Ligand binder design. Structure first.
Ligand SMILES: Cc1ncc(COP(=O)(O)O)c(CN[C@@H](CCC(=O)O)C(=O)O)c1O
Ligand SMILES: Cc1ncc(COP(=O)(O)O)c(C=O)c1O
Lengths: 398, 398
């Protein structure tokens, strides 16, 4: 009911229309070996924004395992609800993830479905000894969690703090009995991570329940690829829950809920018996589950340390050549902030035309005037790939 | 409007724990040809509650096409949001669905994701010319839609009418400018159907936006399996939107949105640019997409009229032997009501020891004291499987 808002919707559709007109959005492109993309005219670009940080999207062992699972089981999924029955492949997949993370792990269609199934239940208090907690959302929490604040609000009090405002979180932890912090482990489209040491300290003093989105941490950091939180925490406690994706880094499909300690079946029961995607939404298909089992084996092999070393070496190379948000960290997300959406779109079109695709984030993905290009470092990037990108990038000024 | 977590679970958990203790829930069973289930004991039972209505989860053409799609792409999926780019396999799949339904159709990883991506946007008025409509939910609309009422309540007024209370709906239409009705085309429980003629009449008179869930309507009902709504409407219009899942009946994986007319990209653009699962939640992997393309080809061929006829034949054979709720309906869902939650778990455990699994519905899945056995007729069932089951159902002495 505002003219100031329809003025924004018109400015909005113009940028979206420009991104399609410029070919940086809506392109139909074929996957090509080397983290590259092929257009119908034959021209191939290097994907600077692929979220397969370990290059496991091109792993022949994962692909063959997915094919073998479909051939042996001769079915795509199950023909009944999960609460009813499970295929043996599913239990092998979750047992493998449980061995890897060292916790009780369930599979879902997506990390989004994991949030839909967990966040409203954590807010109800059934996961916090019958005490409904104060759900504290970080401002930069991914919208698969932030869009569900209203669901959490119907159950308890929902507060949103500024990005990594640890001070404010303590005030809520002091003034309130039970509190939960809903955040991302690492923050994409930004060079920021979660304050694990401060958050852990608040957890020891006030019993703060910690809800992390490990989507851009799984496989990237830590032994066995367990991620950023489990590399600092060591072993999961009864007050820390993780959700993540398995299509990025892990090299598979779907998402997962890391409930907590593997000896406690209570959190899994409560969420499974709750009205959510874990009860009513379909399970991962036989190809995906076969991929998860193979990728889990590779995470226990000597290959994962090698893939992580090549990634962090590639990050070091990039940071030594291009100045981006997060320069110095060990996360594979590097955001090139340009402010203007016109500059961001024009830069993506220049790079894409010169052999490098970098995804453009504007007004709906990021705040207005905070536009920029989201580069993502992968282990499957060659040295020449990064060195050549920096060359093309610096030919624009900035 | 809301859909809050059930806090009192002593009665519920006793029923869940009993179901798992008696093996009717939480069992690890292998899929076997003929719509059958293998156990660690080696015991084989017929699945009487399988959602694969046309038996397409055992079609070798669909499985081969899923394997072929993965062998030729050598990646499970692309590594970017579908806004940035898509594989040609995804465009071929959504074009294939578009030809079948005769509408603009997008795919997601589940029907639940399709609901998350549409209902909040429909409640904002962006789909109805900027006028926020009154969101009118049916009481027995599936919970993947009903759980998001709080999201819709942030954008407009939400109300829930009694099941198929068309007179109460018509009253809501007279009192407001724009109204939208959210429901299922076919309801699993009760054997009821959406009152299409009253709804189409209200759509003509008031402009009632219609939002159908077709998870149990696609494939099983209508010419070319286009569903119950499209078979009566013929050609979709500007004020009708469908969501459905493609793993039950359709024989594939994931879900879909049927936006509206196929020559109109306005609805797709609005939703694709909204902050929802269609933007940020992973696309279907290449096996699922290959399955959708093949399944779409089958639905256009003379194999769908066959499978629909073998289903209606098997439905009639079942209705002549076993007296169940819905007897006489053309929907392949039947309720063997037993009232006692305890006796429902006993019947399911007895039938499953004798070779016929029927999933037990108890509280909270169904109202207390209204427990039943939910059977699903499939075209993959043999006349022997149906008559042999009717024998075991009467030897039980129900
Ligand atoms: C931090 C975070 N959490 C959750 C999700 C959702 O996980 P799903 O398993 O895909 O539901 C994403 C996806 N953000 C991706 C987009 C993913 C895609 O659409 O392919 C990104 O923008 O890199 C994410 O970046
Ligand atoms: C009527 C109905 N709608 C929606 C869904 C959602 O299914 P899915 O999220 O697995 O695609 C289902 C699942 O039970 C359903 O039966």
């Amino acid at each position: 009911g505002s003219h100031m808002v329809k003025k924004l919707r018109h400015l909005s559709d113009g940028y979206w229309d420009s991104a399609a007109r410029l070919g940086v959005h809506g392109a139909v492109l074929q996957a090509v070996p080397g983290g590259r993309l092929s257009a119908p005219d034959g021209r191939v670009a290097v994907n600077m924004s692929s979220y397969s940080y370990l290059g496991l999207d091109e792993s022949p062992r994962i692909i063959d395992a997915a094919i073998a699972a479909l051939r042996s089981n001769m079915v795509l999924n199950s023909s009944l609800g999960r609460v009813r029955m499970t295929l043996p492949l599913l239990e092998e997949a979750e047992c493998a993830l449980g061995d890897l993370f060292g916790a009780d792990v369930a599979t879902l269609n997506s990390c989004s479905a994991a949030a839909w199934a967990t966040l409203p239940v954590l807010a109800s208090g059934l996961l916090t000894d019958g005490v409904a907690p104060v759900m504290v959302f970080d401002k930069r929490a991914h919208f698969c969690m932030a869009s569900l604040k209203s669901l959490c609000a119907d159950e308890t009090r929902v507060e949103t703090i500024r990005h990594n405002d640890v001070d404010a979180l303590a005030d809520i932890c002091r003034k309130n009995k039970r509190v939960a912090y809903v955040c991302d482990s690492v923050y994409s489209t930004g060079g920021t991570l979660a304050p694990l040491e401060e958050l852990f300290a608040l957890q020891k003093e006030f019993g703060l329940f910690l809800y992390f989105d490990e989507a851009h941490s799984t496989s990237v950091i830590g032994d066995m690829g367990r991620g950023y939180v489990l590399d600092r925490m060591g072993a999961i406690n009864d007050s820390t829950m993780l959700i993540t994706s398995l299509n990025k880094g892990f090299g598979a499909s779907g998402g997962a809920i890391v409930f907590g300690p593997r000896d406690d079946d209570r959190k899994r029961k409560i969420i499974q018996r709750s009205s959510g995607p874990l009860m009513w939404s379909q399970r991962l298909n036989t190809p995906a589950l076969g991929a998860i089992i193979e990728s889990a084996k590779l995470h226990r092999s000597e290959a994962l340390p090698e893939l992580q070393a090549k990634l962090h070496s590639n990050i070091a190379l990039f940071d030594g050549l291009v100045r981006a948000a997060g320069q110095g960290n060990s996360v594979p997300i590097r955001y090139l902030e340009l402010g203007s959406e016109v500059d961001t779109l024009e830069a993506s079109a220049y790079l894409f035309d010169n052999g490098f695709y970098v995804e453009p984030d504007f007004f709906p993905i990021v705040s207005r005037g905070a536009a920029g290009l989201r580069a993502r470092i992968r282990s499957s990037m060659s040295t020449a790939d990064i060195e050549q990108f920096a060359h093309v990038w610096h030919k624009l000024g900035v």
